[model samples]
Target: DPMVSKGEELFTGVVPILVELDGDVNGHKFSVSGEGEGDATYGKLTLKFICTTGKLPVPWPTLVTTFLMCFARYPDHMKQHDFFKSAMPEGYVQERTIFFKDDGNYKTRAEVKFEGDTLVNRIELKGIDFKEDGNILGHKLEYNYNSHNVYIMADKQKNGIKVNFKIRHNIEDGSVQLADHYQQNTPIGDGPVLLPDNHYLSYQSALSKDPNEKRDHMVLLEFVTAAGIT
Candidate 1:
């Protein structure tokens, strides 16, 4: 129930992951991960992202498309349905799910493996090499099973240029900033990272919005000890 914590420790798996994006433009390559958790009875989940390498470039359209597409491709195994409603200030109708496709703009392939406490995600994009300040690199994600935490590392490099960073998430001890801007309508600040509310709507009106889509993409998770590795 949204009214209280179930005390069941909803997520017991050692590691949970959503998306990881990487491509460089203007000498910066980005790597980010989004993970979510659902209420036991609600059938929906709330999501969040950690910028492990660099902040998502505020104006890079392709990189933005790559991140959102990750959600458009959110796996069904992670939640009841392939689609999950987002928490928004608008009415329920405004929280509907949306989808996107490459439309031949780029051809890509990926290899993902989750064995032990590590998740290795590698991707390649062809037909649209970003040659400007653009550079490309593979990405890696790791987890500390005992501590229930996750980490991300990535880089974009060439003969004389390189960019990379590592972002860590200690779910039990950290907080998340749901909104991108601060104002009377939506105050921007960090709050303790916790599980989704009942029906995934408790924070609906308080979720943060992307500078581009204005959609809130905030959520968190850790190793599932109760559920075991999936």
Candidate 2:
């Protein structure tokens, strides 16, 4: 039925990806590799619904269909043409995952590669492109991706706070702002980045509305990592 059709398309087009970050990674080039086959399924439903509908007694197919339609389209909504606008030039790497960077005007590819060291020091973000821009040098763009933060304890009772920043371009205001955000973690590296206990803090974007007003295309990712990361 509808579920089966969606499943077929989903299976063909989707693959699970693991986001890794470290403090010591550097250089303009990076690589991402997976050893064995990973599960196609992330879960019954994504985090949003899971937080709310965790107790729902639903059929496997129903849940799968719900997730396939709702959860799958989130990234598209969060990052539009601007997301893919930033990419590295062609002949830069071996294997790359290209995203739909075309804004209905040209053909482009947006790739994000995260590389760095796990224990000692810095982080580097890399992007590459293959689509030609009429040789006129169209746009030199940065990558837009979700930063997955893990807070696990991974080293000899070594727990402390880690700081990071998000870089962005203001298409409307033509300005940029740097905000401070921190994550505390235990000294453990069990793959999942777990934090040292838990803490809280916040920020508001300058693009806020009147609160009473409702409009289309007004949603913003104004939390810790909003304002577009470069």
Candidate 3:
């Protein structure tokens, strides 16, 4: 009950991200912009590969940073999580065995399989073996996403909700692996949950490699009140 996964359901701060670009073509649109700044933890992710440049393609912001870290396993006020998901032929999975950091940031711990749109294209990292010669870590992950069609609403507006998805990325480093594809529509209001400045996540990519990459890649971030200061 209490301690859903760890200390006070454990929540770390400074969750950041804003890799930008917003679509515009005809009507003589587009102005000329730039953005880059990322960092998300609750299961490692460090974006920056095109806003200005460097890493928005590490499978692009892990579906809004692991879906806002599952709202720290419920009780952040409750909304609608679709039982986390289960439908269409099959979709009911979980593999949680956590132990953060997977990119080159090391620490690696492995086993995070997922489903019901929980996500898990490919992951096979394991290193933080309690001192096994230089804490070795060099990973490769696969990507593909679809099934984040959440819509929690209480009749129309109020604490409205809407989220769509289409994501893809093929672990890159060289030798032809620039696969890219995305489609997003995010909107979460006053509550129901999508934390960080109240929601702003955008998306675009019909296939890219930068240089306009079809703009619209915004990942802005949200929150609530009634506090108890200290």
Question: What TM-score fits each model?
Answer: 0.28, 0.19, 0.21
Per-residue lDDT, model 1, residue 23, is: 44
Report the lDDT of model 1 for residue 196. Answer: 20
Query: Taking the tens digit of each residue's C-alpha lDDT, what string does model 2 give over 101-212?
Result: 2311111121222122111111122223423341112223211222333221212243223323332322223432221222222222222212222221122222222355
lDDT score for residue 9 of model 1: 26
TM-score of model 1 relative to the true fold?
0.28
Model 1 poorest 10 in a row by lDDT: 87-96
lDDT of 3 by residue, 1-230 (tens): 32222322123333332222322211112221323221222223333233333323223333232222222223233322222211111211222222223222211111222233232222222222321211111223233322222222221342222333233334434222221222122222121322222222222222223445554333322111111111
Task: Please name the candidate that would achieve the greatest TM-score relative to the true structure.
Answer: 1
User: Deviation in angstroms for 142 in model 1?
Assistant: 32
Model 2 error, position 196 (Å): 12
For all candidates, the clash counts are 14, 22, 12
**Candidate 1 ranges beyond 4 A from true positions:** 1-15, 25-28, 38-45, 58-107, 116-230
- Candidate 1, number of clashes: 14
